Design a protein around this ligand. Structure first.
Ligand SMILES: Nc1nc2c(ncn2[C@@H]2O[C@H](COP(=O)(O)OP(=O)(O)OP(=O)(O)O)[C@@H](O)[C@H]2O)c(=O)[nH]1
Ligand SMILES: Nc1nc2c(ncn2[C@@H]2O[C@H](COP(=O)(O)OP(=O)(O)OP(=O)(O)O)[C@@H](O)[C@H]2O)c(=O)[nH]1
Ligand SMILES: Nc1nc2c(ncn2[C@@H]2O[C@H](COP(=O)(O)OP(=O)(O)O)[C@@H](O)[C@H]2O)c(=O)[nH]1
Lengths: 435, 428, 373, 49, 434
């Protein structure tokens, strides 16, 4: 009755969604073959459908332009959980071109992917929306994402569209064409994404170093925390809670203006198993931990900005009015700030289901939060990737691949003034009231 | 002492009549083997209304079961209450119905009419004082349209002083189970207007509306769809079979429900309808029952009674109840909404209350309403026919079997000539 | 799919020829189909029917569907002949003259395994019949002991069926010697209710060849053997019926439990297959009296039933008070301790039928234990 | 998977060694039947005195 | 009581027949050596009854050339077919309409009508004819045309349905399919009452995509067509909720006496290890027949108007979830009807789930065939019309025809009949303006 289709696109998307569906399978019932072995009823019908006897299969489509990373899923443990053409493979990678991911080899895949979205949506009673999972990095994660959202805005315009984005790092990064691809696809996902939640890699690196007590983390451990974030955010419509929230609540409480739709995610208890029992992990302590500017998952300091709206999702054994003491303690601090036009800047939801731990790095705790803070501090990362783009674009570097592949030259400029307008409106809403 | 001759024309009419005979054999206590096991001696007083006696007390129905294809007769025979009927009354034919009014009225149907009237006349002559005929059929499709309306015409010609009841299934707005529903239904109504006395219109989408919103079921079957009609059919003719106060037979219902002779199109209704989840919480009384009838969701044709003025309303209650409840409750309905009742007919409601309820149940009520809102069900078919007839489509079969453009236009013209007075009397 | 076929007759109350039909039960979902043998047409198309069960499907059994009551005479085809063919085995089980006091326990332990029950007699064996029974051990030094035990008290003769019922009933028997059964302790009927190896609880045939002669000696084909140990004229006598319902689900040993734990003295048992005209005579005083005499008639002859004579003891409370009212739901609240209070349901499918009027007592006793074998 | 030899399926290489529970069962959903066909609910069975 | 004959003309017709028999024997519980096994009327629609327990078929396997009836007469189905039903010619028709019709048609046409008569003798009500052939070779074109002429002469009052194997729009199997197809449709327009159209390339694509087999053969192609005609003859075969006849199909599928070419599509074509993860629900199996990939001639239904649509629902089908599905279908703007037929659907419910032959199809509860007459079949007609023009523009292969009883005028007459055909399909496809 309350379902949402997940579209995992790009290689970053398919690994983070593999972590997602691993955590969802270690949640309610479902053995990785796909069968629930009997030993809350409707709880599967948000993320899993239900065939004869029982073969609960995900409402997920796995799209990329290259094989072997879908083929790892099709040869892995969860090869029987999924349906063999929910996982769709191309035969030629987009290879770090927004132009290739969007403009030449997209027509071999966009029709079939739209058709499977249509079949999944017909296999749905009441749809909340589409949770897509990708990066601002490679061509499959950028161009096919842009084309997919260009079609889905026309076809399913009223439905919710939430993006989970692997933003390129401020300082490390894994390639060189992140400025080109990220800015080119943000120019197109600005007017189509109803809300786009963002997460960076170096921030989770720092979190796993300083709190998980692991010095050499791998991307499976990186995406496990993203799986925890998503299983926390889209959790109150799985179960029953003291304060029920859904995706429409998240939009209407996180997005103040139609262009300002980029919140920041932050987890709490990221604590590390042989640390979980020397603290009590109280509600106030985990609240202060998630407002600490050292556990943010996008590398931008929140004190370089003003909070505009924050939502807390307390999952687990949380009495819903120690939350009130924590909020009253936070709103009297002098290191945190809010805009002068938003007196009520907190949206809170509480769910009774404690976080389920997988065999891995995190600790089994009874309380956790999901933080969504819509701050102006994201503009710092936006502007520094703009600076990288200007140093890229000074004397025509790397643009010959894009123009000889098929995108027109002026789109590179148009993305730049689109992101310039996205710079401008942040300080336009961040200036204090004077009239 | 009164008798009613039952006829089933078409597949749809045949299963509706089969469930009818099951329901009233349950009410009169008749086993599938023909004998009697029952609990009340009041059930045998008027068993010679629907059942003719035979040797050894084996009561057989006074029903004639006709179709143009022998694939519904064996289904009716292989039903649970199958071999109660007379095997000579199984008037079949090795041919094809072809869902064609032309092939039901001027072809093998009209060839089988001369044989089915023989057993109709025999069942009419084997009675002391016959009152009426009832025919179960469907407009949408053949046989029940073509042979059905031709049976109405011939029986009206042979017996012109007797009541003709027809329980007729009309196509829905939501779907169409064939593609020639307007073509069949217009030629059906053109015969049905200047002939029969009591048309009771049934619609499949209204049946699903009842079975989903009121009865709260998720997989309704054709047993369910014909069962609601069977309950209505048993409750229309129940003051004639079971005793009580303020009895009302079919001709009294006709003279109190038909102001003008053409205006005899009715929408039935049955309203002790409780879901399984709401049966325990129900508060079954006459103040509940009248409100359930006049609620415009239990009306078994897809017409909205709030879109037109009621001309006449008749209610046949069954059970031990008070006429204080009945008379004053129906009066408070008439005063609660007076703009939805006509003023040229004051006190326009009829009350008939039986003592004996349906088995298992205590207070039932059958609704029959002559209203303006039949105009939607008729105009819809009229513009469907204009759309399908402006381009001459689906027509070569009719022109080959013997129909004419002129009489097709005559059927459409008569449909418009009945769409006129339903607006005239609703707008005074 | 996976259908079961049988051949049956139905006697029509009109024209007297036995209507010959073809029954078809679907165990995948409970559904009935019938074909006609005389004219090859259909009859009662494949329809759901939640009153016919798998145990009712047996040769010679008496099955009711849509008040058109059937009796089975053939095994359909070779497929269900294989499925329920060499399965069924007829066996003759004998309650000894001892453990007649605990007869209900033994009837109950036959009832546990699924051993379906077809004939039941309580007889005091005659002098001439003993030497016919003792063919198994003839001319060995045990005739005096086995004669003195067998022709001492009333025995109860039993016809039993299940698959390979010979060896399954030997498995209930355990060791033949009751002392050996006690020393082994395998949970056998002698291990629970025996005394010794000449008076144990039960012993009968060892194979089908011996079962044939045991059957012919104890249940004859025209009938002379059991002297019908009833003591018809015993003044304080009452005849009651464990109904074909309670027999069909299987309650006989538990009824025997409930009635012997009140001190009432069971004196005679017999199962007789009711026919219509014979049911009219036992229920002769009911037509016009009870307004639903027909359902009582069809419940009586809708299957086999055991008549039994009960001897009045246990002062103040008579059998009419032990059975209480007629309807079990009258008895469930009013006098909530009777055997008709809680051993049976509905009103059609009651547990027992009492003698109602006092005088009307030796009459019933005679009907099912004198003027009907 | 790579060269389908004949009219047989192109079975995946990471799927070929799994136990073949695939063919011999019924695929789809049985209709959810609901409560019986109006004889138990519209007039209900019987009430006794 | 309700019997229809099947006439298998040509190589393609015999192979369609072989698939049909391989399905139907296990459908009715007929062993290959036709007989019930050791363990009431459903056979007596398409099988007649012979002494002991034998069930002989209602077919005429006519072929102008050997080997094709001979795999049947040698293989696993010898003891079922009557050797007098199995009729062979003596010499090949050789992709020649003039040889299927004019010169070697006369040594076999009297015998085949005598055999059709002797089969129809033990038939109380002849419900219809089912002609299984191709629009390709000389047998399947010319003998079908001549046979249809004679059958219209001597059984004119009976319905006559065809199941044609159309030439491929892009590949094609010979070089004279356009000639043979135009010549046979000019003569079979005026007599055949309804011709279901099935080509090969749409089957090739549907078996590659939704059945996940890359290299199966003509047997696996004809198996799906056998499923289609099994869904056609279903309601006069078993009992259901809405029994729909062949006359029922005819009287609601051809709104004008000339437009008689419906396209038939099948749903559940899913491939066994492809169905653990679907529901096979009524709504989605209805949507499968509407999507433009299960359509079984290579034409775009979006490039046309749906005129009438006969849905045959089969299996565990609650009869008014189909109400819900059709109500959902009538709102989608991609499937767009004409303005003069609002009531565009015909439902037929059957209570017997499909039985799967040992092969490739999944064994499922439900199955629908769609019988849609579209204005988009003129687009399929147009390519073969263009190919006919390109070959006749300088008399390609014409001497092979005209030296064999052919007259030069019938080519121009057939081109003018094709002109009347797409004129008919355009001015019936146009909307209402008056
Ligand atoms: N969590 C997680 N993130 C990844 C993984 N691989 C790559 N990423 C992120 O994704 C970015 C590049 O990966 P993608 O953009 O998804 O690669 P792609 O879109 O498939 O582009 P191509 O290299 O053309 O195939 C990097 O900056 C990483 O931050 C992974 O395995 N797990
Ligand atoms: N389903 C099916 N179709 C076939 C088969 N063989 C051929 N066809 C189709 O039928 C067409 C030719 O068949 P026919 O009309 O019977 O040809 P013919 O007159 O017998 O002459 P030849 O086939 O060359 O011997 C081809 O274009 C194919 O598309 C088959 O085995 N199965
Ligand atoms: N109430 C009810 N309606 C039915 C039943 N069976 C069919 N119908 C309706 O009857 C219509 C078609 O009947 P029709 O083709 O005229 O039957 P025919 O007269 O024998 O040709 C369909 O639209 C169905 O909605 C049934 O069992 N009960």
């Amino acid at each position: 009755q309350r379902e949402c289709i997940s579209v995992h696109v790009g290689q970053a998307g398919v690994q983070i969604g593999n972590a997602c569906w691993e955590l969802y399978c270690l949640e309610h019932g479902i053995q990785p073959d796909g069968q629930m072995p009997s030993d809350g009823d409707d709880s599967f019908n948000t993320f899993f459908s239900e065939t004869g006897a029982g073969k609960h299969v995900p409402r997920a489509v796995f799209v990329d332009l290259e094989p072997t990373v879908i083929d790892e899923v099709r040869t892995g443990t969860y090869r029987q959980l999924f349906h063999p053409e929910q996982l769709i493979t191309g035969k030629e990678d987009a290879a770090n071109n927004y132009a290739r991911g969007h403009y030449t080899i997209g027509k071999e895949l966009i029709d079939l992917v739209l058709d499977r979205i249509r079949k999944l949506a017909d296999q749905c009673t009441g749809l909340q929306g589409f949770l897509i999972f990708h990066s601002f990095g490679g061509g499959t994660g950028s161009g096919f994402t842009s084309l997919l959202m260009e079609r889905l805005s026309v076809d399913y315009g009223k439905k919710s569209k939430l993006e989970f984005s692997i933003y390129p790092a401020p300082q490390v990064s894994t390639a060189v064409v992140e400025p080109y691809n990220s800015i080119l696809t943000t120019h197109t996902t600005l007017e189509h994404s109803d809300c786009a939640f963002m997460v960076d890699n170096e921030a989770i690196y720092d979190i796993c170093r300083r709190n998980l007590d692991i010095e050499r983390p791998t991307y499976t451990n990186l995406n496990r925390l993203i799986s925890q974030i998503v299983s926390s955010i889209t959790a109150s419509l799985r179960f029953d809670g003291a304060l029920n929230v859904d995706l429409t609540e998240f939009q209407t409480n996180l997005v103040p203006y139609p262009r300002i739709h980029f919140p920041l995610a932050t987890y709490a208890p990221v604590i590390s198993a042989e640390k979980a029992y020397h603290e009590q992990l109280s509600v106030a302590e985990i609240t202060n931990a998630c407002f600490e500017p050292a556990n943010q998952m996008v590398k931008c300091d929140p004190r370089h900005g003003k909070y505009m709206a924050c939502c807390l999702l307390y999952r687990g054994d949380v009495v819903p009015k120690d939350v009130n003491a924590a909020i009253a303690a936070i709103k009297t601090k002098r290191s945190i700030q809010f805009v002068d036009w938003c007196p009520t800047g907190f949206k809170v939801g509480i769910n009774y289901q404690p976080p389920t731990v997988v065999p891995g790095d995190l600790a089994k705790v009874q309380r956790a939060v999901c933080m969504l803070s819509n701050t102006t501090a994201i503009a710092e990362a936006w502007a520094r990737l703009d600076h990288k783009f200007d140093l890229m674009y000074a004397k025509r570097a790397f643009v010959h691949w894009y123009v000889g592949e098929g995108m027109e030259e002026g789109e590179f400029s148009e993305a730049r003034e689109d992101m310039a307008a996205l710079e401008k409106d942040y300080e336009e809403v961040g200036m204090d009231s004077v009239e | 002492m009164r008798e009613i001759v039952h006829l089933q024309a078409g597949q749809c009419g045949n299963q509706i009549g089969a469930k009818f005979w099951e329901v009233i054999s349950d009410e009169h206590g008749i086993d599938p083997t023909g004998t009697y096991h029952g609990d009340s001696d009041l059930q045998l007083e008027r068993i010679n209304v629907y059942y003719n006696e035979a040797t050894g007390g084996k009561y057989v129905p006074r029903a004639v079961l006709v179709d143009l294809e022998p694939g519904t007769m064996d289904s009716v025979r292989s039903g649970p209450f199958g071999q109660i009927f007379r095997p000579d009354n199984f008037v079949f034919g090795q041919s094809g119905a072809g869902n064609n009014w032309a092939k039901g009225h001027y072809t093998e149907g009209a060839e089988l009419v001369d044989s089915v009237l023989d057993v109709v006349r025999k069942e009419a002559e084997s009675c002391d004082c016959l009152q009426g005929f009832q025919l179960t059929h469907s407009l949408g499709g053949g046989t029940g349209s073509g042979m059905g309306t031709l049976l109405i015409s011939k029986i009206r010609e042979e017996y012109p002083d007797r009541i003709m009841n027809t329980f007729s299934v009309v196509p829905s707005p939501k779907v169409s189970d064939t593609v020639v529903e307007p073509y069949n239904a217009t030629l059906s109504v053109h015969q049905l207007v200047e002939n029969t006395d009591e048309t009771y219109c049934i619609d499949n989408e209204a049946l699903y509306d009842i079975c989903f919103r009121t009865l709260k079921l998720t997989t309704p079957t054709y047993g369910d769809l014909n069962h609601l009609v069977s309950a209505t059919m048993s409750g229309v003719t129940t003051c004639l079979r079971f005793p009580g106060q303020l009895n009302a037979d079919l001709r009294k219902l006709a003279v109190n429900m038909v102001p003008f002779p053409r205006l005899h199109f009715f929408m039935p209704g049955f309203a002790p309808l409780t879901s399984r989840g709401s049966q325990q919480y129900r508060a079954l009384t006459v103040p509940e029952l009248t409100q359930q009838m006049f609620d415009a969701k239990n009306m078994m044709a897809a017409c909205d009674p709030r879109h037109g003025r009621y001309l006449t309303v008749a209610a046949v209650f069954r059970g031990r109840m008070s006429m204080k409840e009945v008379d004053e409750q129906m009066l408070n309905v008439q005063n609660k909404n007076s703009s939805y009742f006509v003023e040229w007919i004051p006190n326009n409601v009829k009350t008939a209350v039986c003592d004996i309820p349906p088995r298992g149940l205590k207070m039932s009520a059958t609704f029959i309403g002559n209203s303006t809102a039949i105009q939607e069900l008729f105009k819809r078919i009229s513009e469907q026919f204009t759309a399908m007839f402006r381009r001459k489509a689906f027509l070569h079969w009719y022109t080959g079997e013997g129909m004419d453009e002129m009489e097709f236009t005559e059927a459409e013209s008569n449909m418009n000539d009945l769409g006129n007075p339903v607006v005239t009397r609703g707008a005074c | 799919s996976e259908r079961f076929v049988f051949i049956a007759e139905w006697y029509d109350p009109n024209a007297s020829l036995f209507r010959r039909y073809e029954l078809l039960f679907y165990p995948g979902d409970g559904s009935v189909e019938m074909h006609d043998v005389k004219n090859h047409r259909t009859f009662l198309k494949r329809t759901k029917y939640e009153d016919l069960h798998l145990e009712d499907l047996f040769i010679g059994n008496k099955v009711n569907v849509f008040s058109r009551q059937l009796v089975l005479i053939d095994y359909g085809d070779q497929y269900t002949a294989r499925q329920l063919g060499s399965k069924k085995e007829k066996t003759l089980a004998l309650i000894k003259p001892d453990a007649v006091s605990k007869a209900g326990e033994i009837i109950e332990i036959i009832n546990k395994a699924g051993f379906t029950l077809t004939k039941l007699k309580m007889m005091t064996l005659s002098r001439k019949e003993a030497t016919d029974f003792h063919i198994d051990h003839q001319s060995r030094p045990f005739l005096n002991e086995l004669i003195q035990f067998i022709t001492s008290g009333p025995i109860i003769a039993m016809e039993i069926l299940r698959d390979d019922a010979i060896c399954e009933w030997k498995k209930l028997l355990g060791p033949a010697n009751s002392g050996l059964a006690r020393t082994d302790a395998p949970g056998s009927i002698r291990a629970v209710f025996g005394t010794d190896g000449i008076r144990n609880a039960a012993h009968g045939p060892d194979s089908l060849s011996c079962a044939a002669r045991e059957m012919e000696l104890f249940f004859p084909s025209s009938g002379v053997c059991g002297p019908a140990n009833t003591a018809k004229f015993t003044n304080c006598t009452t005849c009651c019926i464990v109904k074909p319902h309670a027999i069909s689900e299987g309650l006989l040993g538990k009824i025997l439990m409930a009635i012997r734990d009140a001190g009432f003295e069971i004196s005679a048992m017999q199962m007789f297959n009711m026919d219509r005209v014979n049911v009219e005579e036992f229920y002769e005083v009911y037509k016009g009296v009870v307004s639903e005499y027909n359902e009582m008639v069809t419940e009586m002859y809708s299957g086999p039933c055991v008549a039994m004579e009960i001897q009045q003891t246990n002062p103040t409370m008579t059998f009419r008070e032990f059975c209480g009212p007629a309807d079990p739901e009258i008895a469930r609240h009013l006098r909530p301790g009777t055997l008709r209070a809680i051993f049976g349901k509905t009103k059609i499918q009651n547990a027992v039928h009492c003698t109602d009027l006092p005088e009307d007592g030796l009459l019933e006793v005679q009907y099912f234990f004198k003027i009907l074998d | 998977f790579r060269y389908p030899p004949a009219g047989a399926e192109r079975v995946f290489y990471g799927r070929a060694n799994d136990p073949q529970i695939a063919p011999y069962l019924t695929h789809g959903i049985r209709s959810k039947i609901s409560i019986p066909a109006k004889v138990l609910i519209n007039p209900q069975p019987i009430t006794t005195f």
